[model samples]
Target: LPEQFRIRQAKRADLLAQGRQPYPVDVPRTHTLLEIRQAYPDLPVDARTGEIVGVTGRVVFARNSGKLCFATLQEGDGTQLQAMISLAEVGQEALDNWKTYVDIGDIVFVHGEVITSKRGELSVLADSWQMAAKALRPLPVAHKEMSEESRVRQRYVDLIVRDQARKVARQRIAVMRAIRSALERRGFLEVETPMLQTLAGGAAARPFVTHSNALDTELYLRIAPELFLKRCLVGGFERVFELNRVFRNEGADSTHSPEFVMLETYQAYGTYDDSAVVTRELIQEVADEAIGTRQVPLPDGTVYDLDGEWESIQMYPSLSEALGEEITPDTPAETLWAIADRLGLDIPRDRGYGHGKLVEELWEHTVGAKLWAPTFVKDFPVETTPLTRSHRSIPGVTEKWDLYVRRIELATGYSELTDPIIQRERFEAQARAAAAGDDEAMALDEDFLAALEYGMPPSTGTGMGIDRLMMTLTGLSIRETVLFPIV
Candidate 1:
């Protein structure tokens, strides 16, 4: 089996002696595979139509048995046609030459009569054939299931041999079309933002840095387009959105990738409560328009009912009830540390996690990680989140909500803070946290804070991972949803 490459190489030399271009630049193909299939829907067993047509495709399957030869030719889109060759039609020397030259992975051209086999399968009976192109290596068997490790590593081969891969890719296109339609109908302008920012002020994630040789400054690949898009809101764009990629310097997992697609939207004259309307209606519309249903089935046999009102719960309240203690924002770091120890969480103490960070960590353990349906998790600590408005009545909490589905955090929204003084205070606090050695703390952004000083409207913003949405819709891993994912 390993010598097949050399064997195919030797066959190429043999074709040179046959006076045909094994890799031709031009060919006469009268119709595509789809066109041929549509022109003749069906034929009776052993029936023949005198009409002739020409087509080209890669040889997916072929067999030479004595005088009769059969091969399945496939287009890039997976449309296929079967070709039949016989000694009676092409003569003795050409028939033997075809048997000698054609390989399973070769590209071939055929001009043939429309006919059906004895088994009633529509096929082309070739009166003439030519070598269109050649494949140097053998293909994996198209009839078997591909291994998971191999499929991800060689996605080209996976798309070749698996219909499931093609469907997932096409489904992504449908999903994106539906998303743009939903936002446009709601009057949200789709906009582009800078990918390289001087400071990573968007979120508390590690940033990938690159140096500009001419400008002589270190630039960061944006972790999110959040702060830059918010600048548009400050400059008077009422409603805007961007669906693009963000680079986060992080580890990999079934649900995570360092480079991933993210959708960021900002709406003026709205609060976090208003965000519920856009997010909920947008998702429901994508389900109906793209996938045609609100009910998504999971891999574990349960269904995510996206029908009417989704569930809602406060962050602190759920943790308090689950831990059988009244935990609040005022709960000290020492108490939360003991709770973390009791739960055996992986939040290391050496990271200098503050009180807010400790509560956030505990919430993930007791409440956030187990949500299996469409649920809105709200009321996060203001001390931990830098860009959110403080709650109108509740003291140390922000007007923020995270949407969790199938235990995956798919979306997050917040009523943005517009008070420039308080924004600077939050930035100062984050800078202090960075000095304490918390690597994911946001770097201070003077320009962003300066924009706040120029008087911005009270607006709301949200971000959703587009790939994770596909993961939920198809019941597949994030690795499966993303195209050419890092292996």
Candidate 2:
């Protein structure tokens, strides 16, 4: 053991020798520090009354002065209450025992009457107390401002020390709750699907593969729940949604994670246009619920207004307008490569990326960051999305839209492709690309193609990365939004 551990153990022994338990049985914690503070003004004057409330929390601060002590306790909700322990109220033995054993970073149970001190501070006049849990190592002396790594690694300490960390976590919960409620109200049935899949489909992303010894087979963690949710649509569920975890064996960045929560919804008898309307309303509602306004304050010294009409632009035309050149869905790979070279973009040559991938890269590099406001970039190339329906009006474009805010892609909405033959063709093309060194290309799901042959209704689907949405709403990085992000 370390020197500090030995010292703490000595203190624990001292308390045990005095017939005291360092960690005692459960005490009736009748009120939180928040409840006591709220009702302090109405509390009776007698400081020694029998109507004592039991409060338990971690000791954040303690000042010992021989016979008297003043300690601050923090509850889980970031509420703090001052606790006063005096020899006159608790007698010599109790006061001395507390003075010896109770310290900052320790959890303590206190029974006290709520009252206002002479200094006009709302406090708990603690008469009876017990050390609920003992701590060995001292909290970090430099606990005020933590680096990103420290904050994530020691999240428990960070939550105790920083109020903003706790607030962000609570706000994240609120945002998820709002999203769940919004979907539930829209007649969407919340459902769950398998995480371990035979072949990961529904999105153009690499999957984490695992082996099952009993079955003597390989299983892949799902990259998206899109295919299974569509199976629900074929099973007669009109509106279905899933909020679950998906794993991708891909690179990590400020906006990407290997394992992340995704929100996927599929509604039968609807088109991509309907999905666009739902997307805006749902996001606006989530903003109103989580941050209390559609106009959210960003940490980047800017504001994200989630209200009002969002700008909508066609993908090819928007990129064309920005580059001052005619770049369309039919733009050849060589032409796009020339433009990329001219613009000094470091497009990788070894990835086997084609014209569609190049167009996406150019859009992200040149056009994405400039879109600070909420905007829908639509008319994606048919080759860009394997699961999206071809645009009825446009020859080579797909009826797909990507929602962007602050240059971050928030969600992907699709007029789902239902033609079995076309779906098979797209899957085969994806297979060829995957075999040709494009690791992120999706694999073929024969079962899904067969389901499409069963005469499914034309539907719409939208998939959103919950972490990215949280980052946009909170103006934090994806790492910050996640509590224990893999660092």
Candidate 3:
């Protein structure tokens, strides 16, 4: 990079000297090198033999030796195209203009023959490479001293040099694409839900609070699109899905961010069992689309084969069996507390029904991390699932299953409680819990329940964590894949 940007200025002057501006003479293009490559299968190997193929992209790499030059460019979907420029090939006018204006970060429209370079790389042997935009700033040079902050804040610069980083971004897009495709194939119609809900009734997460000045009311940024997505089901869309952004005002860790992508989908008549099957299939599809294969190569030297059948078991019973204890819904609080103390599990001392919370604590402490695969932990207690219907076969448990992979909950779904009576009871209980200082408890939404009272059919819905799933599937830590993830 030059301190004065004199090289760029000189290039601009040369173009003007010949009555042509260095900047594009026409409107900026929407096409990219990748699009050009995918579109023109028969583009010539030699311009003298056929029509010249043109591609526009930012210059990512450049090398010059006075008489000739070489560069590489990047375009859509992580495509990289090589380019060659020589004085003998394009004449003195084109060569000089290119040298002066076409800095490493400048965008240029390269029209040339598609030919193989001496090193066996596909390249554009340019007869003419026109400057599309003159870059005034000294281009970012790839350096070893770069840190995470630098990469995240200036992602464009990182993308220029870090091919691996760029691929991660492409995988991000691939996951989104695969999710939409899978849902659509399953008869799901994609739709948008309002982000400005009066009550964030979806998941039990604290929301980023806001205010609407014009309406003179305080508003909350939606913590989840769950309730609204289900509303679409009530509105006669048999299968509805929403892949959208959600903001949560909470802790930041490797697996948690303030804002992230959440995929919520609902079917008119499906249950947690159906949710489990689709969960495994969807995971398999996205992994194949992104990494070009099925079985995930996990960091712990284990492979998760989505092709294999996902094992299922009742959540509490499984934990009780694993721990060799007689833990049940009616377990005495004192006994559960003593057991937790013996196992050194951290139970919030101030909370009552230490039995209910202690059960979760013991499971997490003892067996949670050890169970790693695409499997279902189903039939959670009613205390844990305020939004799910009680299991039909088991009166005390709810019809919910959490899809766990890499020992983390990746997705949660249920046979919803479309019965307004049950929903009202749950909401009232949740409101009482919220009043008792469980800030993360869900709100009682009368309007939402009103929709349910109109004889809506039995439905099932699930919410999937986009970031967490990608993290496990890609074999990267949860923080590595997100562009602006919280530290």
Against the true structure, what is each candidate's TM-score? Answer: 0.93, 0.95, 0.87
Error of 2 at 308 (Å): 0.7
Model 2 per-residue lDDT tens digits across residues 1-487: 3887778788888887878878888877899888776665554443433457889988888888887788888888878888888888888888987877886788888888776666666677888888888887666664456777899998988888888899899999998999999999999999999999998888877888899998999999999999999888888989999988999888999899999999999999999999999989999999999899998888878777889989988888878988999997778999999999998989778768788888888888778868888999998877668999999899888999999988888998999898999999999988888788887777888888888899778999999999999987888888888888878
Candidate 1 lDDT, 1-487, residue by residue in tens: 7699888888887787767888878888887888878888977899888879888988999978899899999888899999888898878887887898899989899888878889887888998899898787888976767788888898888887888898888889999999999999889999999888788768878889999988899999999988889889888999999999899999989888999998988999999989977898888888887677898766689777887988888989998997899998899889988889888887876666878888888888888877787999888998788999999899888999999988888899999999999999998888888788778877778899888899889999998999988987878888888778877
Model 1 TM = 0.93
Using TM-score as the measure, name the better of candidate 1 and candidate 3: 1
Look at candidate 2 and tell me the lDDT of residue 302.
77
Determine which window of 10 residues in candidate 3 has minimal summed lDDT: 42-51
lDDT of 2 at 87: 89
RMSD of 2: 2.2
Question: Model 3, 1-487: lDDT tens per residue?
Answer: 4655876687777776876656756634444677556655554334333436777877878988687789988764568888888887888988876776677877788877666666666677778777777777655666665587787787766776677788888888888899889889988899999988788778878888888989889888898888887777778988888898898889888788888888888888777778777777888888888878787676678776767677787767878888797677787778878888887776666433334556667777766767876667777778668889888987677898888777878998889888899888988877776676677677789889888887777888888989887886777766668876655
Winner of 1 and 3 under lDDT: 1
For model 3, what is the error of residue 76's alpha carbon versus the real structure, in angstroms, after optimal superposition?
Answer: 4.4
Worst 10 residues of 1 by lDDT: 346-355
Q: Give residue 366's lDDT in candidate 2 (0 to 100).
A: 75
Ranking by lDDT: 1, 2, 3
Badly placed stretches (over 4 Å) of model 3 are 1-19, 25-55, 73-82, 111-127, 142-145, 298-303, 351-354, 483-487
Top candidate by TM-score: 2
* Model 2 lDDT at residue 216: 95
